[PDB]
Amino acid sequence: APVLSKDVADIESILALNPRTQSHAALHSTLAKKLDKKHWKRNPDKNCFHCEKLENNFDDIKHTTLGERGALREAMRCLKCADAPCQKSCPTHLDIKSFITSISNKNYYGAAKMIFSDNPLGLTCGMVCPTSDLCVGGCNLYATEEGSINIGGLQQFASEVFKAMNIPQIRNPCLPSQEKMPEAYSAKIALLGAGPASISCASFLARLGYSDITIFEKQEYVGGLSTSEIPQFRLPYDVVNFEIELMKDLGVKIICGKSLSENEITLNTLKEEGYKAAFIGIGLPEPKTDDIFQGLTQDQGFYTSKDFLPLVAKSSKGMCPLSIRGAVIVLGAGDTAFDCATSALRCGARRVFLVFRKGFVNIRAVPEEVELAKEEKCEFLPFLSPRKVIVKGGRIVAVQFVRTEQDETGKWNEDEDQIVHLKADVVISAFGSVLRDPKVKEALSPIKFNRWDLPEVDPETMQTSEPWVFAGGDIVGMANTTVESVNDGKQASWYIHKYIQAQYGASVSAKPELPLFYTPVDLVDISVEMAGLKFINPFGLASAAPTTSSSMIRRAFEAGWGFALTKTFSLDKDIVTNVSPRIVRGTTSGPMYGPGQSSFLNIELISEKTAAYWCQSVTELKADFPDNIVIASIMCSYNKNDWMELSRKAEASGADALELNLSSPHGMGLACGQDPELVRNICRWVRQAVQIPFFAKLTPNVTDIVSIARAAKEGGADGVTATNTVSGLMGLKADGTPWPAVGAGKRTTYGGVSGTAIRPIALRAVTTIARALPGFPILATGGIDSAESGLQFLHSGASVLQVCSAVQNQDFTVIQDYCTGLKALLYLKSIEELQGWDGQSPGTESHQKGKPVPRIAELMGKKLPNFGPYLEQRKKIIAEEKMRLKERKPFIPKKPIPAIKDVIGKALQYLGTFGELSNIEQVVAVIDEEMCINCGKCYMTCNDSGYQAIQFDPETHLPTVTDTCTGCTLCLSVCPIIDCIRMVSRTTPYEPKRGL
Amino acid sequence: PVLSKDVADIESILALNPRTQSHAALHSTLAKKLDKKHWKRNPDKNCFHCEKLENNFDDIKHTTLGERGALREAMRCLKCADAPCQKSCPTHLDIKSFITSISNKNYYGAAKMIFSDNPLGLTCGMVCPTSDLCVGGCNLYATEEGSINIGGLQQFASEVFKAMNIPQIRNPCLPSQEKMPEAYSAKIALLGAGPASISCASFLARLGYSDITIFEKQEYVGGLSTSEIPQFRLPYDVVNFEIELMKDLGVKIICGKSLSENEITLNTLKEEGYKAAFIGIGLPEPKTDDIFQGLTQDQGFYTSKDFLPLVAKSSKAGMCACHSPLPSIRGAVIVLGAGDTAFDCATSALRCGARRVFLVFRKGFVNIRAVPEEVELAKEEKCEFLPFLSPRKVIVKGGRIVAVQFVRTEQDETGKWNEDEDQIVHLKADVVISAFGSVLRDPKVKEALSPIKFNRWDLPEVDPETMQTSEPWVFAGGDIVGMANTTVESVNDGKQASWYIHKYIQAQYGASVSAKPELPLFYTPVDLVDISVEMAGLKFINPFGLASAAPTTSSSMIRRAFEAGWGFALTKTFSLDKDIVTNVSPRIVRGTTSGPMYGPGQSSFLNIELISEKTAAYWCQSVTELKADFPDNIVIASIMCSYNKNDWMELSRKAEASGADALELNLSSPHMGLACGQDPELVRNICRWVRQAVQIPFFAKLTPNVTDIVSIARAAKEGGADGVTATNTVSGLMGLKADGTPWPAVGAGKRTTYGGVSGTAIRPIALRAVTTIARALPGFPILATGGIDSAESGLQFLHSGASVLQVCSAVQNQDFTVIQDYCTGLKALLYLKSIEELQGWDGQSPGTESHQKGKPVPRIAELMGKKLPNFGPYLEQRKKIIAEEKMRLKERKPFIPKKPIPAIKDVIGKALQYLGTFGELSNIEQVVAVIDEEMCINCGKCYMTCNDSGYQAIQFDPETHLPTVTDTCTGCTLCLSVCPIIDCIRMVSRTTPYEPKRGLP
């Protein structure tokens, strides 16, 4: 034996970058720092002017793109505000609060479905909306140092997961069968142009039940500007495809090759052919051009943006050569100019100047869009109106501008004495767009147009001066964004509907009502029976502060809850007075304030309201809500008369069941629920007093919750509720006083912990009563705050699920997220192609900044982290590879969808004793270097809490697990990147780690 | 009446509460555009002009953090090994350590960390270009949410330290002043009182030198931090506080003395007894240009060195004995330049009331010198920018400037910049500000440095490792040397010089110094506080120790932990060979008790880990080694046997004779609960067996999985335990995948078994156990275990009755070096109890002010009158009552302890006097919620939580989204519990009569 408690020098050497307690101030010269600094540089460089080659690079450049880890953190962050201003600031009124709520709960289907109900192009809009002049500009968290939520990145992600699940849209299932629809619904509707505006309008019309809807498009491709000009590196063409496949799911017909124009389609022909309504969504087809450019061609290198963008599109997109070398001048200050500037780099420009008429603060493009130009090392020339495109040699070679300025009233002039000669090869008119075409205008004869030569519409109804013809989108000249065009189709859709019905003799609601968005997921059954009660869904308010009053129970039933407990009430004699404060927040996960508290503590007593109030309540609630279960929670002292007098009273007022609150003192713990013989007897009393089911509610503050459960079963209870709160003390202030602190003496008493902090306790309770009394109905409670969690508890043996803290953290409306949540989890289970996901979470792509990190037998296993000079090299392998390189059918369930009753107790078979655990099938951890952000947490935690088995490279900060791994699994557990360390099977000799 | 229907008043109260929708909403695009302006929080692109900034010096930094923000951002940091942010900080700050103190609520440890490596830590927080420094290296840049706000964190912790008003002291490691070798009375001069010389002077003083003098030419001190950086990025009182820190060490400052041939020169210093000298005089002069010659400030012409120091002097109260006022600069202003100097000219101009500002650069946007935490300030004050214009002729039309003429510049295929002679621009203007940078040109100064070598650029040449000039006794750094660029580098220059000046001077007295540089850290009297505690007759040097767990797998870990400063460790639990076990894998997973947060600060872990797989031979030998080398750290051998009197007596004696200070009996084994520890008679017996086999103290480790933990603790004391460890982990199960499989999941069958939960999730449970045993068995010694992850939570257990503190999960979340936080945390916490001027602090946190992104919020007269929140047209109407006050106007004595500094023994169990039965709580003194509309951020959460979990007792105003708590509140306190804004809501005594309402009377 040598010195067992000193590390032999191999491990002395693996430990070399571990943290050590620091005892002097370090010594490093400014010159050495200046040199070291470049080795770890993550970012953008201002000692760098030629960033990478961009040419033929159409990969995603949005900064708001989120992967799953990222999207889960941002959604948790959001406050989920009442009457949210984000949604006030959204042109299409998306319920962001709900959809953000659902993301936080891993319900991507319910988020996506909320998103698409109010915007049928929610993905597109996720990607391109200028959120900072819309929803994000209104977010309450801008009032904090960390700032607004990335709402669009969240909208983007949920819809992207919903893309991947491959679920069709369906007809409004509320609606009658098709052959039973009134006749008005078969009127022919024509929409002109397949852009966001008509796609939106026909979707809503399809949703209302219209069966003969046709989109007539000029071009061969669909989607309007999102296809032909929004770049592929901000809006992938296949996002656009998928949103149109959704619309086509509802029966909308598209016909390409037929234009609104003289001797093609006109209003008058639309009339003779029997169309009843026409929606005009043709956009602004023509380029706002300057006279000085008259005569130049593409051969001399002149393009309008309507020449240029569609060409680059046709080349980087299944939509239908690129070649812009040298110095490029881009004229204009809107979105159009900024997208030419950046697609220029993609056909290989050496330099891109953007030149503005007016100045910097007059930039109209989407400040996100101005970002991409800045970081690509575009040049910005303010205050210069064009005058002369000098040509020589067949090719443009410069351009002569005049200076402009404004004379402290606010109007502009030009100084002829001052010109710039501006060497260039390509000039791109990027001013904007108009409707000029007279054969188009003729085709709308006779509607009125205004000054601007746009169709005039009433802006509330979208109707033109002909009442069968409507218009929306860019062509009306008010909307500048995709989400505003969509909202134009939305608004039009309802008044087209009012107009068509009236022509057939019928009238429509007074309050506009368009339908939500639907999928087959929504038809999934999620009722369950337990103790011979039918629950319309398995979620319920527990007996607790959300049921302080019976009008709140009323409001919760109308929001959709399946059942509720009354707050526990007692005979009169037994009535109690609360103290205040008595509900405080948990400290169970550090100093996070606001949404998502991991527990609360309460020292709250039973109801201050009387048995009379509560019985009369129960009767009013069961009269108006016959299919909602109402359980009456009651409490007495250890007293046979009381327990019989109170359970008969509750029963006769019409409760579906009782809950015995077993937290009363005795006179084997001090509360009744801590002693089996007392619980046995109480159950015997109640069982002989009433005929309805009753459940005993167990306390987890016991050595063996199984022997209280059984006692209840032996005493005749029809089930148990597991569990009530854990006894605890939530913490002390640094001078010693507690919180909650009552009176001027700052007194406290022990309280009950609730929330997700206690979920492991409750789950293990539920699991262990189910293995031991299998068959005996359990109602779970303790930290249920999504559908995924409820499902854990159902899997564990519970039949219905009681909720308290998740509603204190939010409001009765989570119920909508729990339902669509559970319908989604059960439906995915019938989808073969999606067997690799965990519930709604896809199999994880290898990501940094939640984007896919490439695959080339160079970058795979020659150690290149994403920083410093290695980064510089991955970006040269990736931008000489883009040099070199120059079917949608919905899944179908194949197994019927399971009911709740088919998933209850499924997990029970995987539990067991410790010696049913294989000690033969050992694992090692394994780190995916493409997924690693170089933190060294796996390393610090294997060193001071593990087996010193990870090498951490001092020059790359890449870790590597050695053959010493014992599969403890700590490293996986602390790693911030989801699915970066995987546990795999040991493949070489492990004997245990014995010491001498 | 229908009792289960709201009344009509309440139904009105409920108008804005959420409701599950059923219809897509209809709203015209035109209406949406009208309604958008009502809610807007931000500076809008419709919007041309700016606010009125004249005479407005209020902080504009985007990186300033209040306590809420700062705790959130420190918890986000991964606290990385070998951290690249620290590699990228020019003074090598230990970011990971200071950010872990902040996130453990120990601002004093943070601050001491910061000021140890950088004596201008607070300034550097405010002004560092951190995207080109520490923030540019952050690993979290590789995530969507991005890099950590290090500048911000460093700033907030240093402000809390500035507010505690604690002085620095002499490194208490030194011998007393008269035992010091004569070398340390060597006279040292430093030239210039900026960052470089403050840093250098400070580190020299740390080392023991008593006779240091900084000679300052001006009459203010601090160099450019004082004379040019504006007040609204770097307030003056921060500089004054870093200087005071320096003076506490005895550094002397003399103003109005110049390095100059007419005054101080290297000769008059050599002749008057200085043994060494540091040149940090910066770059005194502007970089002038010929086309401005002979144009004075009477004419609208300034250099940056004329302009900025006026703006300073009238906006920095405390800097001059002269009083003077803000230069008036109406009109259009041209700023020439694109570095730091120019952008501060451009914002300082808008405060002088310039009507419009244009920055004109010789080169491209792609070529700008300052640091986009700066350039950003000028874009959002609406300054205009003109690239590729170099100035030719300033046009002087009878007295005033009226214009400037320029030529377009561009690059050739050479890439070199040349000037199109004919393309000329005639920008009118009233004021011109050249902000090209600085030089040393003055020959009076060069000559006083004679004879050191100067280089091309005309600066003292130095050795860049040692900061030495060609004269071996004269050093130089900071701006004067041409490398430094930023304050923190100029600090580093002097830090680096200090140790070589130390080596130089000790040689000159005939001594040598270490090979490896060793500058002392930063100390204050807080570090001298004693935090040892005596327990069961053992003395602990500090009350923090490693629990029996994965962080004590191998005795070589315990060796490293003792070397990092842990007071004590348990071994993993071990047994006799016949009970040795085989472990499974996976066996330790992360909690789901706080949702899907990956990375730092997990709220719990689960484990299905058994006892050590190393044998009692290995362990017993280790305890001998360890006690051999660490006789002052306590080492407790954790042991386990079946219910068997011989085995327990033999194993406890084997661990006695190996040298252990104590034993911990782990009562988890099995044969009202299958484990020994769950039954009071089995515990009494196992404790009796051990008590009779050994004479050292031993502790029973109790499980919280029981009905009454007191009864088991009492069972331990009845059979002789010297105390109890409370508590082992909580029985539980961490969750299942959506397919019903478990995690952990072992082998091909993916089986699992019940496990134990650990970490801050079980603290309520362990605290209750500890306060329970402590009231029932007064004076019975307790070791506390269960969710201790900072000094602060640690003090909670001491207050609850514990003497010493076990840690596992917080080290699994991080590494052994948290101990340093715990120790400085707990000294800071005790010391602060003696500072009566801080009685309103809650430990190290200061009583809140009215924050809005961590900024003082207005306390005006009609503004506190009729309710105005921070968005839409109300934001504009405050911004207007914030251009009326700001156009209505156109120190550190250290605290002394006044009470003795508690020992640990003085705080044990003080929380017991507040704990009691429910019957002891007063129901006479009821409270109500009151809300501060200034701190409110308009979320609705207090409202929704009263609406669906409360008493419908808050009104949410439809236009302002401002809540008001109404007379029907019962104090339940949920709203205060859900508010995101720390101490916006406050629970106060009812003054009005209260009926606890009953439904039916």
Ligand SMILES: Cc1cc2nc3c(=O)[nH]c(=O)nc-3n(C[C@H](O)[C@H](O)[C@H](O)COP(=O)(O)O)c2cc1C
């Ligand atoms: C403020 C509050 C009050 C409660 N009041 C009662 C009660 O009166 N009767 C009862 O059986 N449970 C009561 N409970 C317990 C809850 O019904 C529930 O069992 C516990 O909170 C754990 O579930 P949770 O994670 O969803 O909150 C209360 C909980 C809280 C926070």
Ligand code: SF4
């Ligand atoms: S000193 Fe500056 S560079 Fe260093 S961490 Fe602080 S802010 Fe960063």
Ligand code: SF4
């Ligand atoms: S204390 Fe309770 S009743 Fe009062 S306002 Fe807050 S939530 Fe409501």
